[PDB]
RNA sequence: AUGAGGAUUACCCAU
RNA sequence: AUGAGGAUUACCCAU
RNA sequence: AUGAGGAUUACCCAU
RNA sequence: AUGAGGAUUACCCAU
């Protein structure tokens, strides 16, 4: 065991999926990048602290990259056009379970399902209403 | 007992159980991620250390995804909309011995247990009344 | 009724239990040590004092040794991961009577006992949940 | 009973065992060294004390010397090359009832067994990985 | 997965061959250490960087022992007569691929193959004619 | 005798292989550059000298281009878009002998071999995990 | 009271 | 440039 | 002489 | 510690 592995962030149906994969643990912040440049890439970090005497917190956050080719100086670069930035904060107090936590994950699991009110409102450029 | 290893976060009784493998100890600080994008993981995080001459201290986050309307894969913003924070930090005095600790888990394994108050209200997106 | 006598402190259920036997009484302190090394001996001292006016207090301390692959008469460096250290200090009012007292140590007890939260807690490395 | 009594600290099986035995209590510290000269011997100590109002702490230390015959002012002194020292604090509520505690004393047991993460980690000049 | 591990830094064959393990990762700072006498130990350690806004930076050091006993008194220690110390960095555009940054590998391996100019040059206490 | 030679930096083969040839050696410092234009070229150098009363002392460089046309002003040139540095130290004893030599080059080779966590660490823009 | 603070005449140190 | 000047990280020194 | 200091005409910087 | 505060070298900002 170790869950420290990579895994599928983006899934294209086995066609252009987008893995990611550890590539450091410097300063108890894990992190997974695509397969690309340091410019282009898909980033993961993740940490957790005691933040409280009695809570826990988890700092996520993802990069989703808009890939494209810069002509600087008359030369032609891979870079990224933009970047969509989530940053994600949970804490959770230390009397919780393991079923407790199981709740949360699966919480956030539906929170996201495809055909629920928020994927369809971020995906549609559009607010809840 | 080396227990740094995969274990199942969430249990959906054998289909579809959410399982969370080691990903990085930077830091003597163990990480666990799903396999998923790290803007859409679930994360656990752990680390133990002496917060002061009477106590040691347990830091836990855990990052929990929102699962209705997700985008498997796809880019999610704002971050905050899309993640749950726990944030546990438990305080033991160095006087407690692995039995009186063990009393300290189970509290915490009854907090969260399935039927209880505050399980309860946190999953009707509830308050205590 | 002369209490400063041997004692089993870890029960494993007559094979394997740990006994502890006075080992000094400097200051009327009382101290109990398991047959080891003094690095690896579980160790046990109690005294009594008055802490105030109104106010008798007992100062009772415990000391564990770590035990998964521990080498029986090794050196291990550095102290503080190889031991676990309890402090109790219990004030009882000057007005307590022996009942008062008997009903003070089985709070005691109660706390402790097998499959509490406290000892639950302890015994599986966690926090309340 | 007492517990104060004299134990092999370290058991290199019946031959070249190091036994160590109660030498003083001064102080409400209680003292084993091993049969050498002050200088050569090995030395544990115990002592505990009602650090807070509920707790209870025990502190235990432990010296195992590297023996050497140095030679000062042309004349041979039997001295120590150099010390290990094991410094370990244990805090123990006053709640913790002896089972609790018996819990404790198995933990530091299990801790320390041969085979396991620490010792092995120890025993080999190594960190945990 | 992981790439802090244990790995052959001297290959001597299948006798002799020097092995580093792991031992500490404190500060961004992966340090790996030999086995036996941290005095005659091999060190090497490694960290990286993001030095500018388009550069990452490796720093890589590693520390090779003359391993020698040290009489003082007529009391002899394990020690290192003299160390020798390689000192590397590494700097990285983030615009390099996979592919750029494979290639920079495979030079630095070339640059020391068996026979080449440099590897030779220091294997006989020489410089370049 | 001479070792101012030409050799293999990288070696893809036998086809694609990188070159670099003897250019210059003008004060005690060693230059290999690959073939056509200096602007894409790979540059190799290395000097040595007496660092101080006891150590000698070398310094190793070596850049890897990345090959790119400009273009400006229709106008178009062969250069490199950025390029990667090595640059390593490596002090050495006056008392190391032709083995002791032999050794450390054994330790650079081995530090980089493939499979290795530096040398897979940069192969893939990661770090340490 | 806390330190994955240092040492070794049950001792210094920071907060 | 010279020294039957001195030393030893291709270096000081006198004229 | 030291820097997990910065770069890239064997070069700058801090101590 | 809180922000339906801002950004993007695990970073600034207000209270």
Same mark, same amino acid.
């Given at each position: 065991?170790?869950?420290?592995?990579?895994?599928?962030?983006?899934?294209?149906?086995?066609?252009?999926?987008?893995?990611?994969?550890?590539?450091?643990?410097?300063?108890?912040?894990?992190?997974?990048?695509?397969?690309?440049?340091?410019?282009?890439?898909?980033?993961?970090?993740?940490?957790?602290?005691?933040?409280?005497?009695?809570?826990?917190?988890?700092?996520?956050?993802?990069?989703?990259?808009?890939?494209?080719?810069? &002509?600087?100086?008359?030369? =032609? !670069?891979? $870079?990224? #056009?933009?970047?969509?930035? *989530?940053?994600?904060?949970?804490? /959770? %107090?230390?009397?919780? &379970?393991?079923?407790?936590? =199981? !709740?949360? $994950?699966? #919480?956030?699991?539906?929170? *996201?399902?495809?055909?629920?009110? /928020? %994927?369809?409102?971020?995906?549609?450029?559009?607010?809840?209403?």
């Amino acid at each position: 065991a170790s869950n420290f592995t990579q895994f599928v962030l983006v899934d294209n149906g086995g066609t252009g999926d987008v893995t990611v994969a550890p590539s450091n643990f410097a300063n108890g912040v894990a992190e997974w990048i695509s397969s690309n440049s340091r410019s282009q890439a898909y980033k993961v970090t993740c940490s957790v602290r005691q933040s409280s005497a009695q809570n826990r917190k988890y700092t996520i956050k993802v990069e989703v990259p808009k890939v494209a080719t810069q &002509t600087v100086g008359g030369v =032609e !670069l891979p $870079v990224a #056009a933009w970047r969509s930035y *989530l940053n994600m904060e949970l804490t /959770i %107090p230390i009397f919780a &379970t393991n079923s407790d936590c =199981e !709740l949360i $994950v699966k #919480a956030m699991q539906g929170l *996201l399902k495809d055909g629920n009110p /928020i %994927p369809s409102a971020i995906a549609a450029n559009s607010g809840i209403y």
